[PDB]
Every structure is written in C-alpha cells, then in structure tokens.
Swiss-Prot record:
The lineage of its organism: Eukaryota, Metazoa, Chordata, Craniata, Vertebrata. The modification Phosphoserine is found at S212. This is Catechol O-methyltransferase. It catalyses: a catechol + S-adenosyl-L-methionine = a guaiacol + S-adenosyl-L-homocysteine + H(+); 2-hydroxyestrone + S-adenosyl-L-methionine = 2-hydroxy-3-methoxy-estrone + S-adenosyl-L-homocysteine + H(+); 4-hydroxyestrone + S-adenosyl-L-methionine = 4-methoxyestrone + S-adenosyl-L-homocysteine + H(+); 2-hydroxyestrone + S-adenosyl-L-methionine = 2-methoxyestrone + S-adenosyl-L-homocysteine + H(+). One of its GO terms (cellular component) is dendrite. Belongs to the class I-like SAM-binding methyltransferase superfamily. Cation-dependent O-methyltransferase family. It comes from Rattus norvegicus (Rat). It comes from the Eukaryota. The N-terminus is blocked. The chain holds residues 45 to 259 of 264 of the full protein.
Length: 212
C-alpha cells in the first residue's frame, strides 16, 4: 500500500533534514505545491506563527493532526516545557504524525491522542492531567467546531484569554461556529483572510472571556 500521506512523509525523509522543523515545513509546502496537494499552507502558517508568538501558550490543543504539518509548525515555536496535544481520529494518520514529529525532532513536545475529539476532550482532565488550555487550533471536521467549543466550555477547559484559532472557517466554512463566537460575549473574534484553489478562505481567532 502507498497512500498520499506515506508519500509526504517519504518526501520529507529524503529532502528535509532530521531535527529541523522548518525544512520539514518547506519540504511539505514544496511537496503539496509541486507534486500532489493535501488538506497545508505557508500563508496560513504565517498567521498560525504570529498567534503562537503573540500569546506564548504553555499548553496547546490541536483538533486534527492529519499528517503533522500544523503540529510541526506549532510545536517548533513552543517554549521549553510547553506541550502540544494533538487529536487524530484515523490511526494511519496518527502514525504518519508520530514519524513526522520524530523526524523533525519534536516528538517530546507533542502527545498524540487517537480518537474522535468529543471522546477525548472529556478525558483531558482526568487522563492527560490538563487543567485549562492556553490555545486551541481547530482543523478537524467543520461541523464539530461549534459543538467541540461548547464541549470544551462544559468540561471547564477554556479560561479567560484562551485563544481558539479556527481554520477553514470560510471554505468549506463554519457558519454556525462563526455566528456563535462573534455573537457571544464570551468570545472576542478576529477574522484573518488567507487565500488558498485560488479562493479566499480565512481563519477565525476567538478569545474566550469567561462564561456568560
Ligand atoms: C470528530 C473528530 N475528531 C478528530 C480528532 C477528527 C480528525 C480530523 C482529522 C483531520 O486532520 N482531517 C483532515 C484531513 N481529512 C481529510 C482529507 C482528505 C479527504 C478526506 C478527509 C480528514 C480530517 N483527523 N482527525 S474528526
Ligand atoms: Cl464520530
């Protein structure tokens, strides 16, 4: 068997450099640009980097590791001792992600949780010893953004100033998630447009202010 995702890891393992997350980033960026696209960006990576650098989170939740691009891009910017938790529902992508972090030298900042987001979010406190989350990046199924944001509320995982950065909120779009965070007083929201497919997409930054 030879999947697109094995093919990406293998281009990285040949062209990027062991323990250099940026040559991993550019090799992936290079692969998805010249060889076959994958569901990856440097234009939205600039936005993702600015938000990591602005808020210096000590504990990040990512929903949707996939191949490990956005986990290499985040964890490369985290301070010593900070953690990334990444949930991946497909075990083969989870293996790609473990190897992509192992090659990039970041497998000690990341913990991969294999599971659907709404099964693992309730276990975060008991099992992975989380108190609150400093940042949350949502890049999974667009119809889970809103219910997972409220599930994170329920379980008391968001604090005042938690950053939620939501990808692909324009295309495919997350209309329900955007209406809620923009309309709720618990969230202060900034929309970052980024092109893609030559289409305007966007990320939403939504900062939690505390319950209503
Ligand atoms: C309830 C859930 N909890 C989690 C943790 C979920 C999750 C999302 C992802 C992910 O990263 N992508 C992106 C890639 N994509 C895809 C790409 C091409 C074709 C079809 C699908 C699958 C979803 N991995 N696990 S869904
Ligand atoms: Cl499910």
């Amino acid at each position: 068997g030879d999947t697109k995702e094995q093919r990406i890891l293998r281009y990285v393992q040949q062209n990027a450099k062991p323990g250099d997350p940026q040559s991993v980033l550019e090799a992936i960026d290079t692969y998805c640009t010249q060889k076959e696209w994958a569901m990856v960006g440097d234009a939205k990576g600039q936005i993702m980097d600015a938000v990591i650098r602005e808020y210096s989170p000590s504990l990040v939740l990512e929903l949707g590791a996939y191949c490990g691009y956005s986990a290499v891009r985040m964890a490369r910017l985290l301070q010593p001792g900070a953690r990334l938790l990444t949930m991946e529902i497909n075990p083969d992508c989870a293996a790609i992600t473990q190897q992509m972090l192992n090659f990039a030298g970041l497998q000690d900042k990341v913990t991969i949780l294999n599971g659907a987001s709404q099964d693992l979010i309730p276990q975060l406190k008991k099992k992975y010893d989380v108190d609150t989350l400093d940042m949350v990046f949502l890049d999974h199924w667009k119809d889970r953004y809103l219910p997972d944001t409220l599930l994170l509320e329920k379980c008391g995982l968001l604090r005042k100033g938690t950053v939620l950065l939501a990808d692909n909120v324009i295309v495919p779009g997350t209309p329900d998630f955007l209406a809620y965070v923009r309309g709720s007083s618990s969230f202060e929201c900034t929309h970052y447009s980024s092109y893609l497919m030559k289409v305007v997409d966007g990320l939403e930054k939504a900062i939690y202010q505390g319950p209503s």
